[PDB]
Amino acid sequence: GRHMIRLGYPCENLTLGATTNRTLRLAHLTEERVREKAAENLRDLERILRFNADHGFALFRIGQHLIPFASHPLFPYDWEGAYEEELARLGALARAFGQRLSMHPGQYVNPGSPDPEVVERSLAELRYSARLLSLLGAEDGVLVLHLGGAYGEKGKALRRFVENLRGEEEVLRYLALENDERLWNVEEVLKAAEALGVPVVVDTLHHALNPGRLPLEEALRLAFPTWRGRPKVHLASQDPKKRPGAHAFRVTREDWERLLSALPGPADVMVEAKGKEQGL
Ligand SMILES: [Mn+2]
Ligand SMILES: [Mn+2]
Ligand SMILES: [Mn+2]
């Protein structure tokens, strides 16, 4: 039914066996083989949107590998010219379904790195991700990123992060920043986000493990105003007895109820669980 809290899951759908994350070995990165993997990923994206419209999921995170190696210097064709018509069509479908699309580049995308080549590769991956959202016409699309490593000194790390992203107009249209379980708490991310003029994604599990001085309610109250559109929040539960921050197969009733009770208002909740669409 119709709830003020909308739900999503990331990358793939276990029920369908549909995924947006097919890739290949660099040795196999021919135009032919890449076009084949991309076509499968795009076919599965469509399957997922349609599944989501029937099963009440309004959010979906598209895998980084949708177009495998798109941002790699050896990518063999103009993927934007190849796919712009198809992405416009899929994006129109997603909007017609009232679905919100996002992307979450991985741990290796580090704009605050002091290594120029890591920065360049990271920005390339962000530009690909932002362009994809643009091609899909994802109005309120989200491109979620952690602040990355502290590289020995947090103040200089955050300075490089901001300085290396400030001129990235298209990336900043979608970018939102997320707290983590070790390095950057909600209060720290709010400061970074304010500097770049972007929203803050609160991750409930990361917050529980690294709360700083804030209860969940106050974290969410502070993060809410950073969004022009509906806030996005991440909900996960701890995979019992694994590394802190590892995601359980299914979110617990207790974590879901804690979030529901703490939310200051309507929001979009990305369920991060190994069970994907079965994760809540
Ligand atoms: Mn994250
Ligand atoms: Mn998260
Ligand atoms: Mn996490």
Alpha helices in the chain (DSSP H): 31-55, 79-96, 116-135, 154-165, 169-174, 186-196, 204-209, 216-223, 253-262
The amino acid present at 239, given as its one-letter code, is D
Annotated domain spans of the chain: 1-280
Rounded to the nearest angstrom, the distance between the alpha carbon of 205 and the centre of ligand 1 is: 11
Q: Indicate the resolution in Å.
A: 1.5
Of 10, 5, 104, 8, the residue nearest 53 (C-alpha): 8
- 126-161 per-residue burial string, b: 16 or more CB within 10 A, e: under 16: bebbbbbbbbbebebbbbbbbbbbeeeeeeebbebb
Asked if residue 72 belongs to a known ligand binding site, the reply is no
- Nearest-ligand number for the alpha carbon of 247: 3
Transcribe 101-150 into DSSP letters: EEE---TT--TT-S-HHHHHHHHHHHHHHHHHHHHTT-TT-EEEEE----
Asked if residue 247 belongs to a known ligand binding site, the reply is yes
| Residue labelled with tokens 């991700």 | 129
Residues in the 5 Å CB sphere of ion ligand 1: 178
Asked if 40 contacts 66 with a C-beta cutoff of 8 angstroms, the reply is: no
Asked if 11 contacts 274 with a C-beta cutoff of 8 angstroms, the reply is: no
Burial class (CB in 10 A: 0-12, 13-18, 19+), 93: middle
For residue 122, what are its two tokens?
A: 């990271």
Rounded to the nearest angstrom, the distance between the alpha carbon of 71 and the centre of ligand 1 is: 20
User: Hey, CA dihedral for 279, 50, 232, 118, is it positive or negative?
Assistant: positive
The amino acid present at 237, given as its one-letter code, is S
Element (DSSP H or E) covering residue 8: strand 5-10
Of 87, 95, 172, 84, the residue nearest 136 (C-alpha): 87
Of 120, 119, 114, 87, the residue nearest 103 (C-alpha): 87
* Method by which the model was determined: X-ray
CATH 3.10.20.30 fits 1-280, yes or no: no
